[PDB]
Amino acid sequence: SGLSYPDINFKIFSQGVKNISHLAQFEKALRVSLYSQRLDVIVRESLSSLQVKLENTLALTYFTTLEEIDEAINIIKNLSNDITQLKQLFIEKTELLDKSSSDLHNVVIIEGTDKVLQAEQLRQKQLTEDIATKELERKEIEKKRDKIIEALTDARKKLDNQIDTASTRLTELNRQLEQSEKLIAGVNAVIKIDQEKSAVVVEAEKLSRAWHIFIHEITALQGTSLNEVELSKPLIKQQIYLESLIKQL
16 A cells, blocks of 8 residues: 556557567577567557456446345355456466566577677778778779770780789678678667667566556455445556556557
8 A cells, every 4th residue: 555556668668579570680689579579469468358357347346246235145255256366367467477578588699799799890990901902902003004005915914814803802802891791780780679678678577567566456455345436446547557558559
């Protein structure tokens, strides 16, 4: 008594699972989308199944207690059993959602990615350093061919061997530069995947704790079952809260 439901911003969650499922481009980053998808569906239906179950039980709570109004001891049996079954649904859905969340949190990607960045940086500086020198060589023999052509012919056609070798080296290194840049971009993509997946996991923990808070509130009633008017209020409070959460997607 006296607690408040945590602030849940499902925009980051929704757009994060969207990003991750749509960022499966650039090997192992595939699997992080699969588990996050399972979690994604787990929540997606659970909060909806909890909604329709919450409202239904509402339509039943005033039903059973309408049978309590009819006299104006089985109603207590099925009443407490029904509210405890709702609590049990909250139990199992918290267990399932949190199992998915803590299972998703185990798998990670970094600690084996910055290594590749370190290697790629040195190869990249070596590449951009050597391409300039090979281009200098190409330019030297280019002046040598231009000055002689602009006017023996055996030499004019023999220098083309060195021209073609230098050109093949240039194309041989440019594709390597593109490969290194692609690797760098993919590593940065996997880093951002980590970041947004972490936001998703934090949101999952927040929602699990919110469900824990409401189930704590449900347990606060126990089996006294003295008043219905009060019982209706926390149920509809989670109804609004969870419905607003369902709205945010």
